[PDB]
Design a protein around this ligand. Structure first.
Ligand SMILES: Nc1ncnc2c1ncn2[C@@H]1O[C@H](COP(=O)(O)OP(=O)(O)OP(=O)(O)O)[C@@H](O)[C@H]1O
Ligand SMILES: [Mg+2]
Lengths: 258, 19, 297
């Protein structure tokens, strides 16, 4: 039922602004880089596969990491700990059955103890002021998916795939709002599979047109075209399976005819 | 008067950050 | 850190520790503290604690209990709430003599629907609406409390936790094991609570899940494909279920008038798509004369 659909869309669109990291926090980090961040998020993808976690839990964790690193300075040797604590917090929020802490100790080859993971959870919690209900690319795609003409799961899985690729690359995707990345992702997926475009009904709903999604779109398009050659490969492997209809093996269009 | 209802393929890894 | 609060007395044993009533020694503010013992070698900060806080920090409304502070020690986590006189359950019990007047029932329902509507508008399911989780003050305000079982849903919903909502207040889509539930589950609960306010006793007081369904089928008739498409194909529907005729709805809660009957019926509607939202329910004629009376305490 549409009943509360529009209300939630507005509130998400309000909250996604407040839940934003800083555009270039990586500038002021004295020991960590984007390339490292990309190595962490790629690994967290594997973590979600091994435990069958929702894509949303992945998205949430990245958001927690980005917000934590925006205000806290971190050595590289502790970056996996913040990544782990994030995954755990996200799991507790979002999942019906979160895995136990021992599992989060395990997947890090015992780099940190159970206490370190626990003490880190409190830090992350303190720094995020307990604001963990962050809007995500996924929450938006999900909504956008209701506007399909008609439902096509290849389009959905592809958009999810595109939406996931964006978590890897701080530069450039930190510049865009989740709802924006989702606009481009859904349209690019729609276009790759059916040849269709960002539909009128979503113009009415989101305010966004194909012209305002333009800068995000052509970023994502290069990311999509370049995907096979990225340093990080977990997402392509993830979306090769039947669970995701093998979308990462689809032929991307060479232009978007904008 | 009735309570509320309450609630390894991938190996572990230490991530290598080289640069 | 906690030195500013003076514990006055105990106020209702809260499953991760006890719940006190306290006074801020400097401002004079009266508060309710909810202790959460963390220990050593556990599973860290509980997920109910994580949810209750984050979603409550987003829910600023006159009819939702106000979280004031989260005192965040490594040893224990204290939650500081605004304090209210008592919960609805205890209020009805000391009113089990001469009942609760209709202007006040009307007012309590109106405010609750307001608090519920704010929750659903902020993508939040309460999933534990029962009288002991609704709080009242000296002036006639009522508030949603206990967000320990709350979660933040998405559009459209996924499959969420099944073990949800206290039996007597649990919707029939949960009992039938459906793939998806949503906002309707909170509206089902309020309807039971609406009736519970009139008669002062539980509408559907079952002692098992099967007993709960049947109690509902006698009150509201056994649902069929015509009243609820999809009903006979739901995972825990059995073809063996006795098919009870639907009784005259005036007989469900006899003391309700035409407007009250209408509104309750729309709340206890079987199909969750057609169940009234908290939103729409505010425009129902039942609330044409809504006032804000003071309860006697
Ligand atoms: N802010 C408050 N003001 C007054 N009383 C309160 C407040 N918070 C809680 N209480 C009392 O404590 C009881 C339990 O609180 P709460 O529901 O948060 O704990 P719970 O463990 O989630 O539920 P329960 O204690 O019923 O198992 C309530 O029924 C109410 O009587
Ligand atoms: Mg309770």
């Amino acid at each position: 039922v549409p009943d509360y659909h529009e209300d939630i869309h507005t509130y998400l669109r309000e909250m996604e602004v407040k839940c934003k990291p800083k555009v270039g926090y990586m500038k002021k980090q004295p020991d960590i880089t984007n390339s490292m961040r990309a190595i962490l998020v790629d690994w967290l993808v594997e973590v979600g596969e091994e435990y069958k976690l929702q894509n949303e839990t992945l998205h949430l964790a990245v958001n927690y990491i980005d917000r934590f690193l925006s205000s806290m300075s971190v050595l590289r040797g502790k970056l996996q700990l913040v990544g782990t604590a994030a995954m755990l917090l996200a799991s507790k929020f979002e999942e019906i059955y979160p895995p136990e802490v021992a599992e989060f100790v395990y997947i890090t080859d015992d780099t940190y103890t159970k206490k370190q993971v626990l003490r880190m959870e409190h830090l992350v919690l303190k720094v995020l002021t307990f604001d963990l209900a962050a809007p995500t690319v996924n929450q938006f795609l999900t909504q956008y998916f209701l506007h399909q003409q008609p439902a096509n799961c290849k389009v959905e899985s592809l958009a999810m795939f595109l939406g996931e690729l964006s978590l890897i690359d701080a530069d450039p995707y930190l510049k865009y709002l989740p709802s924006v990345i989702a606009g481009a992702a859904f349209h690019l997926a729609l276009y790759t599979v059916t040849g269709q475009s960002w539909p009128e009904s979503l113009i009415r709903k989101t305010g966004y047109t194909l012209e305002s999604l333009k800068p995000c779109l052509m970023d994502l398009h290069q990311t999509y075209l370049k995907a096979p050659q990225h340093a990080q490969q977990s997402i392509r492997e993830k979306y090769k399976n039947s669970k995701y209809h093998g979308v990462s093996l689809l032929n991307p269009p060479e232009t978007l005819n904008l | 008067h009735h309570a509320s209802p309450r609630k390894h393929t991938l190996k572990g890894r230490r991530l290598v950050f080289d640069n | 850190s906690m030195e500013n609060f003076q514990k006055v007395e105990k106020i209702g044993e809260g499953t991760y520790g006890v719940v006190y009533k306290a006074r801020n020694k400097l401002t004079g503010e009266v508060v309710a503290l909810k202790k959460i013992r963390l220990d050593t070698e556990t599973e860290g900060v509980p997920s109910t604690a994580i949810r209750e806080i984050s979603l409550l920090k987003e829910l600023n409304h006159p009819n939702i209990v106000k979280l004031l502070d989260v005192i965040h020690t490594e040893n224990k986590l204290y939650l500081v709430f605004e304090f209210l006189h008592q919960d609805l359950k205890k209020f009805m019990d000391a009113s089990a003599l001469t009942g609760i007047p209709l202007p006040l029932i009307k007012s309590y329902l109106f405010q609750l629907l307001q608090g519920l509507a704010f929750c659903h508008s902020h993508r939040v399911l309460h999933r534990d609406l029962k009288p002991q989780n609704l709080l009242i003050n000296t002036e006639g305000a009522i508030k949603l409390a206990d967000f320990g079982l709350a979660r933040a849903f998405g559009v459209p919903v996924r499959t969420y936790t099944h073990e949800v909502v206290t039996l007597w207040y649990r919707a029939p889509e949960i009992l039938l094991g459906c793939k998806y539930y949503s906002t309707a589950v909170d509206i089902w609960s309020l309807g039971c609570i609406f009736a519970e306010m009139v008669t002062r006793r539980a509408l559907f007081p079952g002692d098992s899940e099967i007993d709960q369904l049947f109690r509902i089928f006698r009150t509201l008739g056994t649902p069929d494909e015509v009243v609820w498409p999809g009903v006979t194909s739901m995972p825990d529907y059995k073809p063996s279920f006795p098919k009870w005729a639907r009784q005259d709805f005036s007989k469900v809660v006899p003391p309700l008038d035409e407007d009250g009957r209408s509104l309750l019926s729309q709340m206890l509607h079987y199909d969750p798509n057609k169940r009234i939202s908290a939103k729409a329910a505010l425009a129902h004629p039942f609330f044409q004369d809504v006032t804000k009376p003071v309860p006697h305490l």
